[PDB]
Design a binder for this molecule. Sequence first.
Ligand code: SAM
Length: 216
Amino acid sequence: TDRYEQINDYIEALLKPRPDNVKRLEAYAEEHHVPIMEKAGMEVLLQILSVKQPKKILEIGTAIGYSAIRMALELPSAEIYTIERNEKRHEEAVNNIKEFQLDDRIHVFYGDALELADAVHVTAPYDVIFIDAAKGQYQNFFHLYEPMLSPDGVIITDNVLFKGLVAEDYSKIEPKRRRRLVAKIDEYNHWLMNHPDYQTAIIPVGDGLAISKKKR
RNA sequence: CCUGCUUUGCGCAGG
Ligand SMILES: C[S@@+](CC[C@H](N)C(=O)[O-])C[C@H]1O[C@@H](n2cnc3c(N)ncnc32)[C@H](O)[C@@H]1O
C-alpha cells in the first residue's frame, strides 16, 4: 500500500456505520463487482450536496441505484432523475429504489444518456448534474446536459483521476484502448479547468471528483 | 495475430 491507498483506507475506517439496508447494497455490489461510488468519494459528494440543498438532481449512470439512494436519503425533499443504459442494472435499480420506498422521488430512465436529452429536458432545470458513467464520454455529457443546469448549479464529474494514472506519465500504458481513455480524461480535465464560464476544483478523493459551478 | 467496439477489469466490426 502507498500513501494514497493508506489515506483512503484510513478515511473508510473513520466512517460512521451506514443503515443496514444501505449496507446490503454495498455488500451486493462488492460480491458482484458492480462498480459503485467509492465510500470516501460518496461522503464528499453527500457533504457538498448537504451544503447546496439541491431540489433537483440529474445523475448519468445509475448502476444499481446506490448513489441515487444515498442522495435521496441525505435530501428528503430532492427529486432525482437518473439514467442507466444497461437493461439488467436498470431493472435492479428500479427494484432497489422500490424497496427503499423512494420511487416517488427517484426516476430511472433506460438508455444511453447521449440519446435521452429530450426526455430529460422535460424536467429541467437541475441544480446538480452528477456525471458518473462512460469514461470516454465526459465532454459529450457535459455539452449535452450543461444547458439544463440551474443558474447557481453544480456539475460534478466522477472518475477524473483514473487511479492516479491521469497524473503520471501514461504515454506507454498498454493496452492502447486504456492509454487512449486516460488521455481522453486528461483532455477533459484540461478543457474543463480552462473554461472561463465555470469555477472548477478537483478533489482527489476516491476516483477523483471535479466540482464545477457555473458563474453568473 | 494485429486494429475498432463492448466490459469495472469470451462475442461483434476491420486488416
Ligand atoms: C460507475 S457506474 C455507476 C455508479 C453509480 N453512480 C453508483 O455509485 O451507484 C457506471 C454506470 O453507467 C452506465 N453507463 C455507461 N455509459 C452510459 C451511457 N452512455 N448512458 C447511460 N448509462 C451509462 C453503466 O451501465 C454503469 O452502470
